[PDB]
A paper describes a structure:
Human multidrug resistance protein 5 (hMRP5) effluxes anticancer and antivirus drugs, driving multidrug resistance. To uncover the mechanism of hMRP5, we determine six distinct cryo-EM structures, revealing an autoinhibitory N-terminal peptide that must dissociate to permit subsequent substrate recruitment. Human MRP5 was demonstrated to play a critical function in regulating cellular cyclic GMP (cGMP) homeostasis, which is essential for many physiological processes, including the maintenance of vascular smooth muscle tone and cardiac contractility. hMRP5 also influences signaling transduction pathways and may contribute to drug resistance in anticancer and antivirus therapy. From a clinical oncology perspective, hMRP5 can directly contribute to cancer drug resistance through the efflux of many anticancer drugs, such as methotrexate, cisplatin, purine analogs, pyrimidine analogs, doxorubicin, and antifolates from cells.
To capture the nucleotide-bound form of hMRP5, we mutated the catalytic glutamate E1355 within the Walker B motif to a glutamine (EQ). This glutamine substitution reduces ATP hydrolysis while maintaining ATP binding capability. The E1355Q mutant was purified from the HEK293F cell line and incubated with 6 mM ATP-Mg2+ for 1 h prior to vitrification for cryo-EM imaging. Further data processing yielded a cryo-EM map of nucleotide-bound hMRP5 at an overall resolution of 3.5 Å. The structural comparison confirmed the ATP-bound hMRP5 adopted an outward-open conformation, resembling ATP-bound states of bovine MRP1 (bMRP1) instead of human SUR1 (hSUR1)42. The two NBDs were bridged by two ATP molecules in a typical “head-to-tail” configuration. Importantly, the curvature of the transmembrane helices formed an elongated cavity across the TM region with a large volume ~4540 Å3 open to the extracellular side. A thorough analysis of the ATP-bound EM map revealed that no extra EM density was observed in the transport pathway and the remaining regions of hMRP5, supporting that the auto-inhibitory C46-S64 peptide must dissociate from the binding pocket and the whole N-terminal region became very flexible. Thus, the ATP-bound structure likely represents a post-substrate extrusion state. Notably, the unique kink in the middle of TM5 disappeared as TM5 became a straight helix, reminiscent of the kinked TM4 and TM10 of ABCB143, which were re-arranged to a straighter conformation during the apo to ATP-bound transition.
Author numbering: 94 to 500, 572 to 785, 834 to 893, 909 to 1430
The structure:
């Protein structure tokens, strides 16, 4: 072991069958008033996701491969895995039923006979009391054993199924196509559903075993009454199956409706920096409110039928028995003299066992659709590393007339591709936005669908993507990627990528936290980190997807001359490019167009055959609470919309119902104390009719109260969620930067499952229990008020026990809820990088971390239920001992105590006891469960808030955007409130109608002049004004729409391109077509049947960045803002299209004030003025002509060094 004793799996002597191992933790629970992480007794090797998972996998694979897998019914999840553990429960249920039935029924009759004439004997009670004690002890022990077995056996199934699902998730999928938000919802919600169905769905078998016993007892006491019970039970059978059939469809529709809502919830989380400038927070709010309203309506419709089956009529049996008694009544019956109320009380006690059937049937019906869903997840294509084609030696990559394109129902893009690569050679492709030299790179990975051709490959890859993927670990761990530390190789890597000043500028040291996805670094730094990791990993084959795009000229030249030329000269490097500056030193160049290779060979041969591109080459052109749950959460919960009125109506209805049932009980009790037939006999029929109509009322009343309660609780939940969403949406940027996303999404997946499912039932049950107890104590105080002595000791000991167990219950629940968020964080952050993870073949480490996190989360689940079972056992034992003592008292005190004042003693007692036993358990249950509302309230207004959309008090005149005067003055920022300054002493004065180009060294600042305008930075020093009007005083909502920005990284939401094009439908139909046509996409849209309703998702995955950039250009063209700024709009674009692009930009915004950003000097030479910055400061600047004839100018030096 060496970790924890875990006394469950040993100590076979009389120490572990009863719940006694938890007495050790009860001391520590109240000694410190807490329970930390070091004394939780983590799970042993028995309940570990390493032994059961293998067995489940083997069983499922065998059941798949035995015959053709058409559907397989997924019967092996439940019926064959947890089978042997259910036979013991189903065989102990019969024992406990018989023990609870046979004993008391005869004992009460014998005690009544003894209280009739005690004067006969005195020692005849000892056998009776001994039998009573034996039966009670046997019953309680059997019940505790059954619950313990089911609780223990309900965990392993979920523990194995979760890891099976994740292991299936980690596979090569060409596209998601699964509404990614669904996958997370599959991991959490369906985890819970597979648990309850294994721990509750086992008491359904307890119905018939007692029904047959009741029928045979009735036929043995009365002759011809053995036929009506069977007839009235046959009619009861199909109602349950009808209920299940009706609820299955409702559950399926509800889960389908809630599938989509959580997907749109993820889109804002990972794109908040994008939709924070165009005030697109309005459409999404309306869309999510509409889908939430639809979900709430269907949930209410589903739940209305349930409230009618929480025991609307378990009195069918008593109604049938009363009808049989009244109809057959021959005015005396010649048999009913002493045991009149005994049989009625026994039959009333029968409802306790069968009151739990609806819960079992509902859980089974839900588990059916859960099984269907999990079956739907499997039976999909495992397309990865399958080619089934021969290879050849002395080569690494070989192709033979491949014909590939994105997704099986789309027009082919590549046809008849054939190429070869020699070992240790450098090859460049080059081309346009046509042939698409990104499908070729991904073809050999295995992510590309295949139709024909032949692909062969043998080796290892160090993949680099066009974008960047950065984990949450520290920088040194990111560079190492799970490798052994070194000193010489690490220093060589750091010196070979020109990374030294970047590491020196860090505040503390190299070891620093990065973030969720490298949100604290620029694009160039992320590219450099990815390149350094690929360089240090030391793999056989290097694949670079344009690693020299966003970076400058000098650093790129140095890296190519130092790293690629020398440090990587002993391996094979294959990379594509759009710039022909470095193609001189390359070995071979292969040119392909429109998916077809035209000419290939030595680069020196591409001079006279076709000088197409040569014209370009010619010259220049959390925290866990440490206290008890206060009443503030309850006050907030009841202060929801329509709270007090609904609560008062519900309480009044409940009080009236309890009064009615009390009056009926008194009526039947009085009727019991009457003549034994053959006297005063017509009134019986009238009384039966009165009783029948009374029941009716109660029923009607119970239906009404259920309806009202369901409506009120659902309204409260909807209002709470609607309040929460706006607060999360207006969260400042720093909160999103520090706190990971897995800490926010949890409150939207797990809390909403428990608040809207389990809470109302427990609340209503506790309310009913407390009103019944108060009525019983009032009645006891009413008649026979001379017995009010034991009440004090009873209440004080019960309070002592409750205050003893509540500490453990609360601490265990809090520790259970705390440790579930890193789970979701990891499962979210390990999906987006499927390509890189598959390339590096690093699934095992992620899987092991997943398993360890799952076990840590599952550790405190068992003890939470074990504590409640232990409390129930203690309460039952105490009550049994007290009633035994009171009965023995009776026994002894049977000579000089009249029976008139003692006949009802055992009666009222058993009720009182039972009522207290139920009350304590219900109170503990609700106190445990009411922590989710507090957890949601943890994000109350104490959290930071974004900035005030507007103000509506000092809005500027509508004619404000007239001049583009900008006056920068001392703009110094920190970006983290702790990090050192990134830009210092920035002051500019730009006259209206001016053009300025941006170019400079990597790192440093570029984009440098971003922020401090449309700013959300919490400016501390300096201030700027636009057109003579300050920026701090004016509101944000109006100001953000005045100017427009084209982001460097394209962003494309789901739905359609139109919705992005018009946030509010303020443009006609021809203007958008003209805008799309003007930028040379005449055939880029008409190629599809949809014209303006294109299906775009997942950041435009159909067409690559070459088209996403121009889509964003077209979108920003129609806005026509006062100031339109382009942030490096020529990242990956050809040279021929450049002119057209800049010509269109100049034609459109001829007089607008703009600041152009580009990575190429030759494409910025036309600007009126230029400026450059070295590290954090701007050097002297003027027109390009002035600085061109200046040897001592950095701009001329870098232009000359650009070659
Ligand atoms: N989101 C961020 N959070 C915190 N610090 C940041 C963030 N972005 C940049 N920095 C830091 O601010 C300083 C200036 O970087 P800046 O963003 O201006 O670079 P850049 O000009 O965009 O770079 P590149 O040319 O590589 O794209 C650097 O120290 C950088 O690490
Ligand atoms: N991420 C994607 N997922 C699915 N299909 C894609 C994706 N990107 C592009 N497509 C489809 O495949 C075709 C080929 O585009 P490809 O990705 O090869 O472009 P590219 O030339 O490399 O891009 P760029 O010029 O923007 O750098 C597109 O016209 C489109 O039909
Ligand atoms: Mg690419
Ligand atoms: Mg930038």
């Amino acid at each position: 072991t060496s970790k924890h004793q875990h006394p469950v799996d040993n100590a076979g002597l009389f120490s572990c069958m009863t719940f006694s191992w938890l007495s050790s933790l009860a001391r520590v629970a109240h000694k410190k008033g807490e329970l930390s992480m070091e004394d939780v007794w983590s799970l042993s090797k028995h309940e570990s996701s390493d032994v059961n998972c293998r067995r489940l996998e083997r069983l499922w694979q065998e059941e798949l491969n035995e015959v053709g897998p058409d559907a397989a019914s997924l019967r092996r999840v439940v019926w064959i895995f947890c089978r042997t553990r259910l036979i013991l429960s189903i065989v102990c249920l019969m024992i406990t039923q018989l023990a609870g039935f046979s004993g008391p029924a005869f004992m009460v009759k014998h005690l009544l006979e003894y209280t009739q004439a005690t004067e006969s004997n005195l020692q005849y009670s000892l056998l009776l009391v001994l039998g009573l004690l034996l039966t009670e002890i046997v019953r309680s022990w059997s019940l505790a054993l059954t619950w313990a077995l089911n609780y223990r056996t309900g965990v392993r199934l979920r523990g194995a199924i979760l890891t099976m699902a994740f292991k299936k998730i980690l596979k090569l999928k060409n596209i998601k196509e699964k509404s990614l938000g669904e996958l997370i919802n599959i991991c959490s919600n369906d985890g819970q559903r597979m648990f309850e169905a294994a721990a509750v769905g086992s008491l359904l078998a307890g119905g018939p075993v007692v029904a047959i016993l009741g029928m045979i007892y009735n036929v043995i006491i009365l002759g011809p009454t053995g036929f009506l019970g069977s007839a009235v039970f046959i009619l009861f059978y199909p109602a349950m199956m009808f209920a299940s059939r009706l609820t299955a469809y409702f559950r399926r529709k509800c889960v389908a409706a809630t599938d989509e809502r959580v997907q749109k919830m993820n889109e804002v989380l990972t794109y908040i920096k994008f939709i924070k400038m165009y005030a697109w927070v309005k459409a999404f709010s309306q869309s999510v409110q509409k889908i939430r309203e639809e979900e709430r309506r269907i949930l209410e419709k589903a739940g209305y039928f349930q409230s009618i089956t929480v025991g609307v009529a378990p009195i069918v049996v008593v109604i049938a028995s009363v009808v049989t008694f009244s109809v057959h009544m021959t005015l005396g019956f010649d048999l009913t003299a002493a045991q009149a109320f005994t049989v009625v009380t026994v039959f009333n006690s029968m409802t306790f066992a069968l009151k739990v059937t609806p819960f079992s049937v509902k859980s089974l019906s839900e588990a059916s659709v859960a099984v269907d869903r999990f079956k739907s997840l499997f039976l999909m294509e495992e397309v990865h590393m399958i080619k089934n084609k021969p290879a050849s030696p002395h080569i690494k990559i070989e192709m033979k007339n491949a014909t590939l394109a994105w997704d099986l129902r789309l027009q082919r893009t590549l046809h008849s591709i054939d190429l070869e690569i020699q070992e240790g050679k450098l090859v460049g492709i080059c081309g346009s936005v046509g042939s698409g030299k990104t499908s070729l790179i991904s073809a050999i990975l295995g992510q590309m669908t295949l139709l024909e051709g032949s692909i062969a490959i043998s080796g290892t890859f160090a993949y680099v993507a066009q974008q960047a993927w950065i984990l949450n670990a520290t920088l040194r761990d990111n560079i190492l990627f799970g490798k052994e530390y070194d000193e010489e190789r690490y220093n060589s890597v750091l010196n070979s990528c020109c990374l030294r000043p970047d590491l020196a500028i860090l505040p503390s040291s190299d070891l620093t936290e990065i973030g969720e996805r490298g949100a604290n670094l620029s694009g160039g730094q992320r590219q450099r980190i990815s390149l350094a990791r690929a360089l240090y990993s030391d793999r056989s084959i290097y694949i670079l997807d344009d690693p020299l795009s966003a970076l400058c000229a000098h650093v790129g030249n140095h890296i190519f001359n130092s790293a690629i030329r020398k440090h990587l000269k002993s391996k094979t490097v294959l990379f594509v490019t759009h710039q022909l500056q470095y193609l001189v030193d390359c070995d071979e160049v292969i040119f392909m167009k429109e998916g077809c290779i035209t000419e290939r060979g030595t680069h020196e041969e591409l001079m006279n055959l076709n000088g197409d591109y040569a014209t370009i080459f010619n010259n220049l052109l959390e925290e866990k609470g440490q206290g008890s749950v206060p009443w503030s959460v309850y006050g907030v919960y009841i202060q929801a919309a329509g709270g007090p009125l609904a609560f008062l109506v519900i309480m009044a209805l409940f009080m009236l119902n309890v009064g009615s049932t009390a009056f009926s009980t008194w009526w039947l009790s009085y009727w019991i104390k009457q003549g034994s037939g053959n006297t005063t006999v017509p009134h019986m029929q009238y009384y039966a009719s009165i009783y029948a109509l009374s029941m009716a009322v109660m029923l009607i009343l119970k239906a009404i109260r259920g309806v009202v309660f369901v409506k009120g609780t659902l309204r409260a939940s909807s209002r709470l969620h609607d309040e929460l969403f706006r607060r999360i949406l207006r969260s400042p940027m720093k909160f999103f930067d520090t706190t990971p996303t897995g800490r926010i999404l949890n409150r939207f997946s797990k809390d909403m499952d428990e608040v809207d499912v389990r809470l109302p039932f427990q609340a209503e049950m506790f309310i009913q229990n407390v009103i019944l107890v108060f009525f019983c104590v009032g009645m006891i105080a009413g008649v026979f008020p001379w017995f009010l002595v034991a009440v004090g000791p009873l209440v004080i000991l019960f309070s002592v026990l409750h205050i003893v167990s509540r500490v453990l219950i609360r601490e265990l629940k809090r520790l259970d809820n705390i440790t579930q968020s890193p789970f979701l964080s990891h499962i979210t952050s390990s999906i987006q990088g499927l390509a890189t993870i598959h390339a590096y073949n690093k699934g095992q480490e992620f899987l092991h971390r997943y398993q360890e996190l799952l076990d840590d989360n599952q550790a405190p689940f068992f003890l939470f239920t074990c504590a409640m079972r232990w409390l129930a056992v203690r309460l039952d034992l105490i009550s049994i001992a007290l009633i035994t003592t009171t009965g023995l008292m009776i026994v002894l005190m049977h000579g000089q105590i009249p029976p008139a004042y003692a006949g009802l003693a055992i009666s009222y007692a058993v009720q009182l006891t039972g009522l207290f036993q139920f009350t304590v358990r219900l109170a503990s249950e609700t106190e445990a469960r009411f922590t989710s509302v507090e957890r949601i309230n943890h994000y109350i207004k104490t959290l930071s808030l974004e900035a005030p959309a507007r103000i509506k008090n000092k809005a500027p005149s509508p004619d404000w955007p007239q001049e583009g005067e900008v006056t920068f003055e001392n703009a110094e920022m920190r970006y983290r409130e702790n990090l050192p300054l990134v830009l210092k002493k920035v002051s500019f004065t730009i006259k209206p109608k001016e053009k300025i180009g941006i170019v400079g060294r990597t790192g440093s600042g570029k984009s440098s002049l971003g922020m401090a305008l449309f700013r959300l930075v919490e400016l501390s020093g300096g201030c700027i004004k636009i057109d003579g009007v300050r920026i701090s005083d004016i509101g944000l909502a109006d100001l953000r729409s005045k100017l427009s920005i084209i982001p460097q990284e394209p962003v494309l939401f789901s739905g359609t391109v139109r919705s992005n094009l018009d946030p509010f439908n303020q443009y006609t139909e021809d203007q958008i077509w003209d805008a799309l046509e003007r930028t040379h996409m005449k055939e880029c849209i008409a190629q599809l049947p949809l014209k303006l309703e294109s299906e775009v998702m997942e950041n435009g995955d159909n067409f690559s960045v070459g088209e996403r950039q121009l889509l964003c250009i077209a979108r920003a063209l129609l806005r026509h803002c006062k100031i339109l700024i382009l942030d490096q709009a020529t990242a990956a674009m050809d040279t021929e299209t450049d002119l057209l692009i800049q010509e269109t930009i100049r034609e459109a915004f001829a007089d607008c004030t703009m600041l152009t950003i580009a990575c190429r000097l030759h494409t910025v030479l036309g600007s009126d003025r230029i400026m450059v910055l070295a590290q954090g400061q701007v050097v002297e600047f003027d027109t390009p002509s002035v600085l061109l004839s200046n040897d001592s100018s950095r701009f001329y030096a870098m232009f000359a060094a650009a070659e």
